[PDB]
Design a protein around this ligand. Structure first.
Ligand SMILES: *[C@@H]1O[C@H](CO)[C@@H](O[C@@H]2O[C@H](CO)[C@@H](O[C@@H]3O[C@H](CO[C@H]4O[C@H](CO)[C@@H](O)[C@H](O)[C@@H]4O)[C@@H](O)[C@H](O[C@H]4O[C@H](CO)[C@@H](O)[C@H](O)[C@@H]4O)[C@@H]3O)[C@H](O)[C@H]2NC(C)=O)[C@H](O)[C@H]1NC(C)=O
Ligand SMILES: *[C@@H]1O[C@H](CO)[C@@H](O[C@@H]2O[C@H](CO)[C@@H](O[C@@H]3O[C@H](CO[C@H]4O[C@H](CO)[C@@H](O)[C@H](O)[C@@H]4O)[C@@H](O)[C@H](O[C@H]4O[C@H](CO)[C@@H](O)[C@H](O)[C@@H]4O)[C@@H]3O)[C@H](O)[C@H]2NC(C)=O)[C@H](O)[C@H]1NC(C)=O
Ligand SMILES: *[C@@H]1O[C@H](CO[C@@H]2O[C@@H](C)[C@@H](O)[C@@H](O)[C@@H]2O)[C@@H](O[C@@H]2O[C@H](CO)[C@@H](O[C@@H]3O[C@H](CO)[C@@H](O)[C@H](O)[C@@H]3O)[C@H](O)[C@H]2NC(C)=O)[C@H](O)[C@H]1NC(C)=O
Ligand SMILES: *[C@@H]1O[C@H](CO[C@@H]2O[C@@H](C)[C@@H](O)[C@@H](O)[C@@H]2O)[C@@H](O[C@@H]2O[C@H](CO)[C@@H](O)[C@H](O)[C@H]2NC(C)=O)[C@H](O)[C@H]1NC(C)=O
Ligand SMILES: *[C@@H]1O[C@H](CO)[C@@H](O)[C@H](O)[C@H]1NC(C)=O
Ligand SMILES: *[C@@H]1O[C@H](CO)[C@@H](O)[C@H](O)[C@H]1NC(C)=O
Lengths: 387, 387
């Protein structure tokens, strides 16, 4: 979408994965979807290094809506959001952060809350802009294909007409199978800043692998359409939650990074471990994810040893390499060379291990190297020519 | 098997899952299958509380064999086991531990090492006894159904004839689909101390789940056949390795415990985290696993919320309850009562949470209670009448 926004993938926090549709504030006041929850997460982002590292969006998902007023104007739940959305937008802005909100192109949101039907698209966009929202996620539950085909372009135009820059996240392709001929990616790039291609992520390694598999099976289609202002969205990071081991956590981070994915956390920032914080706030990882060229990476190799190699092209002739083990036995000594990974001749390279910080220098194409990769884990290199 | 052994499930350490068939001692001397590996693990077991907590077996798996001498007698790899197996057994015995070894009923072991064919069964049994081995795992790769039908009882007879008590672990049923009529569990109980019913475990939550689902699907057949001296074996514990998150590690421990499974670790005891050690050395968990009645537990409840309830009967009118979440979203508040879990009478109960140590008093059958269960995780209770 040509609105000047998201020239690099968006970084932030989204409520959905970790907190879902928890509306029981009586029994569970700390974890229910509420004004308090968002202010508390905002405080953590401001104070715990998140904002400073580039995590700027604080995004509301489903289950925020209370109803519509006599003018059809959208309202938050008055008990869970007593001060209203402008209050929250203003609070978040006061901390140098941006606020994301959620609507559904259809009769109801996926959780059954008031939907943004075709006749409400313009009014809701205007309401969101008036509230000083900075991003919109538009789901597409409880709608027909033709309603979505009209509704998503209609919303992009309505957001534009408000005059406020609002990043536009579209779940549109996910409801249509995410692939041609039903999904037109040139159209999508014109109307959206990012799009959810595929299934909701769940808190499991199986879920991460099914998403990765789908993106890799279809990378010839998906890879070229990603770029500044228009990203593929494989869904939220699971780092900090319950389903992923340490190796798996480091793996999702590295792989989302090579895919030029949004880095949208969804985890309790109040209790996040140092180890998980260290993954998400890795400066070189973020640098790679936020590379100005915005070229989505690809899987370039798959061995019978079940080691996969991903490569992302970066600025200044640099590259990112992810050595990924789909083995489920033990650490594996992966033997390779840059020549075997289709790198250009005569150039001498140097690599920094993204997780360990170690530097491997004087690598020619013919130079044999070994990387030790743990099961369901990665080794990641930031690779550059040296003179 | 009526050999006086394993009146409770065996507890110890097995090399396979974590260290596999790593024989490259030149490049990897600290992790290869060698006498050093086993000696170092023995030290850890003696010094780090493992033995004192009941972890007594230190078991060699595949890839130990060098060959057979001129008389057909098995010999360990001379380079990797320079002092020989008697020496290792002596070392292990001096630390108050027991030595397990590995053989295959067929032409070769699964990794292609010299097999214990039918004409070698007796000689190999005598060799193991002479070495002062305490346990034998007998794999069934590279054999026919008829050879296994002959060989497994042949080995049991051979072991008995040596006069040395040797715990006998049989992989026989796993090669036959693990079910009647192909598997005769009455015979297995008479000839083996434990048997691998099903697929090899791998370092993933998916692997744990597939084993659990197979054991639950067929629990009507499998639950009754387990007891003192003869156990179902759903394979090694993954705790301390790469594939399981914290919640998942706690889940496998609790679930293997209610199933009266062997507690056979397979992990690097030299680098194991305090957090993982705390799981495996939980005193109440071990007490429950090692309950004298040896009654295998069952899944008693399954709900649409994807919460499952397991129950194991214990000595002194006590029970173990495992509340298990197959959810992949967020913590779940599970509401129940002992009455809904088929507890009858006017007995008043008290429960101890096995992981937190918290005590819940005044539980009558009608009493409503709530437990908070994390995704792919458990809450475990030790439940008992109070008077
Ligand atoms: C509502 O929708 C409108 C129309 O879609 C948006 O307006 C566009 O905004 C974008 C982003 O700000 C503009 O793109 C930028 O244009 C700059 C100048 O272009 C001029 O010249 C061209 C002809 O060559 C004209 O088409 C145009 O009208 C301008 O007069 C460029 O310099 C910018 O370059 C950027 O990208 C290059 C290469 O990728 C980089 O090297 C640069 O560093 C730089 O980042 C950029 O392309 C676009 O021109 C606007 N279009 C129109 C018709 O006005 C609104 O932003 C949007 N409003 C809201 C609120 O969402
Ligand atoms: C080769 O195979 C034979 C079986 O064919 C094995 O022999 C069995 O060995 C076990 C274990 O040593 C014996 O079980 C033990 O029996 C002891 C005495 O029981 C006798 O008396 C009763 C009378 O009712 C007879 O029925 C029975 O046949 C015996 O003659 C008990 O003292 C033992 O009790 C143990 O457990 C209790 C817990 O309940 C503890 O309190 C005790 O301390 C003790 O540990 C035990 O039950 C069994 O009797 C033998 N069977 C036969 C038919 O002889 C060989 O062991 C095996 N050889 C090898 C090397 O593998
Ligand atoms: C999106 O929502 C519209 C608007 O209807 C509203 O939402 C519905 C879920 C109901 O709660 C309505 O009370 C409410 O006004 C839906 O259009 C309407 O759907 C209803 C119910 O399906 C239709 O009524 C039915 O008519 C048929 C045929 O005569 C009867 O068999 C049924 O017994 C029932 O009376 C109604 O005609 C229709 N209205 C219009 C103007 O089209 C729409 O279905 C829904 N779309 C999707 C894709 O979810
Ligand atoms: C276990 O091994 C026996 C022994 O034969 C060996 O394997 C043969 C395939 C061949 O490589 C010989 O040099 C080895 O000595 C197998 O029994 C043989 O099976 C083959 C069928 O492939 C048959 O032609 C021979 O008559 C058999 N030999 C004898 C003397 O019995 C047996 O098949 C192997 N079992 C399994 C299931 O792997
Ligand atoms: C890399 O190692 C291989 C052995 O697998 C060897 O054949 C080859 O010569 C080495 N590459 C070079 C040119 O250094
Ligand atoms: C237990 O809770 C249910 C509601 O979940 C209620 O209907 C029932 O009366 C309660 N029983 C007792 C003994 O409090």
């Amino acid at each position: 979408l040509d609105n000047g926004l998201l020239q690099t993938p968006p970084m932030g926090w989204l409520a959905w994965e970790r907190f879902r549709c928890n509306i029981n504030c009586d029994e569970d006041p700390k974890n229910c979807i509420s004004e308090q929850l968002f202010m508390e997460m905002a405080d953590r982002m401001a104070q715990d290094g998140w904002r400073d590292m580039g995590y700027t969006y604080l995004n509301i998902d489903d289950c925020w809506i209370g109803g519509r007023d006599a003018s059809g104007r959208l309202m938050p739940d008055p008990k869970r959001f007593p001060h209203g959305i402008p209050f929250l937008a203003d609070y978040v802005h006061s901390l140098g952060l941006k606020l994301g909100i959620y609507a559904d192109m259809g009769n109801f949101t996926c959780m059954g809350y008031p939907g943004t039907t075709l006749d409400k698209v313009v009014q809701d966009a205007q309401t969101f802009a008036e509230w000083k929202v900075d991003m919109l996620k538009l789901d597409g539950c409880f709608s027909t294909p033709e309603e979505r085909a009209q509704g998503y372009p209609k919303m992009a135009a309505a957001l534009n007409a408000t005059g406020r820059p609002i990043a536009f996240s579209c779940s549109w392709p996910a409801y249509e199978g995410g692939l041609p001929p039903r999904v037109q990616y040139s159209l999508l790039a014109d109307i959206c800043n990012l799009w959810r291609n595929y299934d909701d992520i769940q808190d499991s390694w199986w879920s991460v692998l099914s998403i990765l598999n789908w993106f890799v099976e279809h990378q010839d289609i998906l890879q070229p359409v990603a770029g500044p202002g228009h990203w593929n969205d494989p869904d939220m990071l699971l780092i900090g939650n319950f389903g992923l081991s340490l190796e798996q956590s480091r793996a999702q981070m590295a792989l989302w990074t090579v895919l030029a994915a949004p880095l949208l956390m969804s985890t309790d920032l109040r209790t996040i471990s140092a180890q998980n914080m260290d993954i998400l706030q890795n400066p070189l990882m973020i640098k790679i994810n936020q590379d100005p060229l915005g070229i989505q990476g690809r899987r370039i190799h798959k061995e019978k040893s079940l080691i996969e190699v991903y490569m992302r092209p970066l600025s200044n002739k640099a590259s990112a390499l992810v050595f990924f083990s789909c083995r489920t036995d033990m650490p594996y000594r992966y033997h390779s060379s840059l020549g075997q990974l289709n790198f250009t001749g005569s150039v001498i390279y140097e690599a920094q291990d993204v997780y360990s910080g170690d530097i491997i220098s004087g690598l020619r194409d013919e130079t044999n190297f070994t990387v030790i990769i743990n099961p369901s884990g990665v080794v990641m290199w930031y690779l550059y020519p040296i003179k």
